[PDB]
Amino acid sequence: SRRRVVITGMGMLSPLGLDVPSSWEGILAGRSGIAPIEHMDLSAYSTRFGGSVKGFNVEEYLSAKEARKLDLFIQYGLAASFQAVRDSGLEVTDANRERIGVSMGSGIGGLTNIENNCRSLFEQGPRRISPFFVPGSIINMVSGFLSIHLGLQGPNYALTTACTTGTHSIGMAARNIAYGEADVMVAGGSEMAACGLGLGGFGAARALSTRNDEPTRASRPWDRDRDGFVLSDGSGALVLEELEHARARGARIYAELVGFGMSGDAFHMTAPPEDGAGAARCMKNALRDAGLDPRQVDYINAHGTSTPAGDIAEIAAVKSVFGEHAHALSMSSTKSMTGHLLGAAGAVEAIFSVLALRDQVAPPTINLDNPDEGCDLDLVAHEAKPRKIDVALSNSFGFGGTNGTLVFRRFA
Amino acid sequence: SRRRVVITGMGMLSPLGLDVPSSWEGILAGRSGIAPIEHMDLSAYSTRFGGSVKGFNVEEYLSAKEARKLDLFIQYGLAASFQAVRDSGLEVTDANRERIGVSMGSGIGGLTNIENNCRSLFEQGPRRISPFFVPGSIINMVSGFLSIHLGLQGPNYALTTACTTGTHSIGMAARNIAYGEADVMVAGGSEMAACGLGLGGFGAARALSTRNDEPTRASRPWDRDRDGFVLSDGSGALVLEELEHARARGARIYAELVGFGMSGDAFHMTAPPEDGAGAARCMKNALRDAGLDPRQVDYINAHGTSTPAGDIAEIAAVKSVFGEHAHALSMSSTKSMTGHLLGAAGAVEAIFSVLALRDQVAPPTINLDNPDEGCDLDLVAHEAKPRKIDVALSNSFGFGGTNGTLVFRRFA
Ligand SMILES: *[C@@H](C(N)=O)[C@H](O)C(=O)CC/C=C/C/C=C/C
Numbered sequence: 001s002r003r004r005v006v007i008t009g010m011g012m013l014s015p016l017g018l019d020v021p022s023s024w025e026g027i028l029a030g031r032s033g034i035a036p037i038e039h040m041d042l043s044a045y046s047t048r049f050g051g052s053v054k055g056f057n058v059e060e061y062l063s064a065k066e067a068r069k070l071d072l073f074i075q076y077g078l079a080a081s082f083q084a085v086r087d088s089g090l091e092v093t094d095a096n097r098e099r100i101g102v103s104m105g106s107g108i109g110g111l112t113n114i115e116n117n118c119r120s121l122f123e124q125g126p127r128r129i130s131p132f133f134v135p136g137s138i139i140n141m142v143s144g145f146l147s148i149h150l151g152l153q154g155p156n157y158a159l160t161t162a163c164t165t166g167t168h169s170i171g172m173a174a175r176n177i178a179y180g181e182a183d184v185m186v187a188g189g190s191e192m193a194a195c196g197l198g199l200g201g202f203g204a205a206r207a208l209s210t211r212n213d214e215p216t217r218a219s220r221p222w223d224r225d226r227d228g229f230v231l232s233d234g235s236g237a238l239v240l241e242e243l244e245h246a247r248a249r250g251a252r253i254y255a256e257l258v259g260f261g262m263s264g265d266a267f268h269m270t271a272p273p274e275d276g277a278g279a280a281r282c283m284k285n286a287l288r289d290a291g292l293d294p295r296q297v298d299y300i301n302a303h304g305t306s307t308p309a310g311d312i313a314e315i316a317a318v319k320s321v322f323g324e325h326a327h328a329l330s331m332s333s334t335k336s337m338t339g340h341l342l343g344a345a346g347a348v349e350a351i352f353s354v355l356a357l358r359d360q361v362a363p364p365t366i367n368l369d370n371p372d373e374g375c376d377l378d379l380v381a382h383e384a385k386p387r388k389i390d391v392a393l394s395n396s397f398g399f400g401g402t403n404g405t406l407v408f409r410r411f412a
Numbered sequence: 413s414r415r416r417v418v419i420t421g422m423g424m425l426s427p428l429g430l431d432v433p434s435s436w437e438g439i440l441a442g443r444s445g446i447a448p449i450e451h452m453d454l455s456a457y458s459t460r461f462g463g464s465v466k467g468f469n470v471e472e473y474l475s476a477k478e479a480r481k482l483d484l485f486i487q488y489g490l491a492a493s494f495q496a497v498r499d500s501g502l503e504v505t506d507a508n509r510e511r512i513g514v515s516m517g518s519g520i521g522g523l524t525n526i527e528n529n530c531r532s533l534f535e536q537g538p539r540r541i542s543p544f545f546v547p548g549s550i551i552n553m554v555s556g557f558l559s560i561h562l563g564l565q566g567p568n569y570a571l572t573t574a575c576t577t578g579t580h581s582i583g584m585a586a587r588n589i590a591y592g593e594a595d596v597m598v599a600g601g602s603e604m605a606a607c608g609l610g611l612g613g614f615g616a617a618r619a620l621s622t623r624n625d626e627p628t629r630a631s632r633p634w635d636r637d638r639d640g641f642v643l644s645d646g647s648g649a650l651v652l653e654e655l656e657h658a659r660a661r662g663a664r665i666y667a668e669l670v671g672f673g674m675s676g677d678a679f680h681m682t683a684p685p686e687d688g689a690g691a692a693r694c695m696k697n698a699l700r701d702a703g704l705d706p707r708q709v710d711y712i713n714a715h716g717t718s719t720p721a722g723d724i725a726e727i728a729a730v731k732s733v734f735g736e737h738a739h740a741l742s743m744s745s746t747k748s749m750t751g752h753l754l755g756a757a758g759a760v761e762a763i764f765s766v767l768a769l770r771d772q773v774a775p776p777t778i779n780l781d782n783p784d785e786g787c788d789l790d791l792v793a794h795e796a797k798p799r800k801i802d803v804a805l806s807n808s809f810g811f812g813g814t815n816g817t818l819v820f821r822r823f824a
């Protein structure tokens with residue numbers, strides 16, 4: 001006896017822009033948001049570029065006094081959230097506040113703050129750790145601070161499922177509404193992992209592209225010369241709403257959230273199975289959840305992180321799940337332009353999938369100069385493709401073999 | 413139309429013991445697991461004691477190679493998880509593995525690992541960061557490594573909701589089963605924040621008891637001389653199972669999980685509202701979820717962290733929710749003995765609630781020498797109280813005003 005769930009608001013900070021429309025313009029233009037990092041000295045690091053959010057002004061949202069306490073991941077998460085609530089036109093009242101909840105997640109949350117409080121502790125000692133370190137750094141405080149600012153009293157929580165965080169946060173918030181725990185959820189992800197620990201940590205695991213000479217050409221999903229993902233920062237937030245609650249208040253409806261899949265590879269801590277069996281199971285769970293034939297999918301927003309193993313695993317999974325229809329649909333990686341927003345990747349890509357439906361256009365896979373062996377699908381190489389899209393699918397795969405799939409369709 | 417969920421296995425590392433029965437013996441004996449910390453120099457810190465796990469042997473569960481890369485919070489979570497799966501008697505097969513998932517969470521996850529990789533980064537630079545830093549430190553890797561070790565292909569995720577993490581992880585895993593997403597879930601929490609950042613972080617926010625001269629007397633919920641919570645380490649894990657799946661395989665059933673409630677205070681980043689209005693809403697949501705009259709609750713395992721504001725707010729909430737029945741039920745804080753396991757607090761306290769039902773006994777609130785103004789309920793001061801218990805309730809409250817309540821009842 002589950003209710004239908006629609007998207008009535010979207011908000012975003014990306015390497016391509018400080019909101020959704022500016023980010024989406026970047027996407028359709030094939031623009032890279034990847035550039036040498038400038039906020040820290042990366043001379044000793046094998047990767048010196050990433051997707052920074054450019055020109056972020058927190059004072060558009062919060063007092064400088066408030067924001068001083070908050071790690072950038074919380075600033076970015078609040079900014080995207082505030083945008084999405086505004087965009088929904090939803091009015092929070094005594095009558096609906098217990099029915100509006102929040103699920104904004106992160107991969108690691110306040111790493112910059114943790115790194116800085118660690119410097120203070122080691123160099124100076126524990127009397128120099130900020131009283132605001134914990135409430136300013138832990139992952140659930142986007143959900144926390146958003147609920148305090150807006151008076152949201154519904155379910156209040158955060159997921160942390162590595163690069164799957166954004167996808168799961170949206171899927172499980174949809175489940176909250178579908179099963180009557182809430183009428184409205186603000187859900188998505190924020191990440192700011194562009195510090196020594198983040199760039200050094202992924203560096204030490206050799207996960208990152210080291211194409212320092214051409215940073216805009218580094219993220220090249222399914223291209224034979226790909227050499228790992230590009231670390232990027234940002235936040236995506238959607239207002240999810242029960243269909244009748246939306247219809248009743250005359251809400252502008254972007255799309256319907258019809259399918260959510262989760263699954264575990266149970267294969268390896270960091271590498272995906274070569275045949276993408278976990279991704280394949282996850283996509284099939286989401287399609288069954290949606291009551292859809294695989295042939296109804298027109299657009300896939302791939303995980304497509306630009307790793308050797310991950311990209312081909314995703315091709316195999318799509319070929320397994322869709323058979324001959326795999327050559328009819330369009331699949332692209334917007335990480336070709338945005339790089340990899342980690343715990344935020346699934347939230348910004350949920351928004352790009354919803355906009356692909358609104359505008360009937362497949363975003364491009366830029367830098368796809370030489371598709372690898374077996375990468376023979378319509379990957380929307382170089383340039384945006386206007387086309388029919390009634391159903392869009394977004395994938396995220398994470399450390400621990402954790403998988404998420406979101407299925408959106410045009411709302412009647 | 414939603415399915416019933418029972419507890420068929422439990423696992424724990426606590427300051428009181430390296431498994432459930434040893435921990436539960438400590439609880440019923442009124443024993444403190446709180447002592448001066450010995451694994452680090454705390455001379456410059458205002459708090460020098462906490463609840464350590466004593467004598468943990470990871471090699472009972474993992475190979476040296478398996479354990480070396482993993483933060484203690486993952487070691488502790490895997491140990492509790494493995495105990496719970498063994499304790500369930502569940503056999504994982506090709507036939508049931510896609511129906512068995514994992515939701516083990518943490519407040520902050522791999523803080524000790526983060527501290528250690530930061531020392532290397534500051535002293536020597538990023539070439540000295542472990543390749544295993546990320547997969548070895550991030551919160552979702554208890555769920556990840558457990559699924560890889562046991563071949564679990566069901567829903568795979570992690571919550572991070574501060575001190576509410578364990579309660580939410582259990583509640584939402586129960587929802588997964590109730591709503592047919594899985595037949596079995598391993599759920600709970602693990603925390604190891606007994607490092608500089610943890611003791612310094614909470615110290616800087618003045619949240620911790622500084623009664624260094626009597627560490628076993630420091631955790632004193634509802635006592636007039638209380639001066640903040642006691643930082644403690646450990647893990648709790650429950651095997652949650654659909655009732656018919658349990659009956660069908662002849663599983664031993666500890667208790668039924670009947671109610672789960674969440675709510676946001678939307679009041680303050682760290683302080684609860686004086687009248688505990690958020691807690692009150694959360695407890696009422698759980699009882700409504702359970703289809704129970706407040707008068708059916710016999711035992712409450714309080715949040716009861718031993719903070720001035722938190723303890724009295726919880727009394728107010730119980731008085732609001734239960735009225736005259738507030739004087740009939742028994743409410744205790746096992747943190748009087750265990751200290752606060754943070755993201756694990758909710759998991760170990762879910763287990764103590766289930767055991768209060770099994771043994772028909774209310775655990776004591778030790779150190780309750782002088783109950784504060786308004787603390788005039790049956791708080792089970794000093795000594796365990798044998799009594800009728802058909803329904804037990806467990807609360808957790810977190811930073812961000814995030815609330816969780818779990819309602820368990822004796823299984824027919
Ligand atoms: C994502 C991927 N490579 O596809 C993977 O889940 C991952 O490594 C992210 C883990 C967490 C993110 C934040 C980390 C900071 C150090």
Ligand SMILES: *[C@H](C(N)=O)[C@H](O)C(=O)CC/C=C\C/C=C/C
Nearest residue numbers: 519520574575605610754810811
């Ligand atoms: C605890 C509480 N009872 O309010 C609080 O919610 C909390 O634990 C915040 C941080 C969680 C744990 C990890 C942090 C360690 C430094």
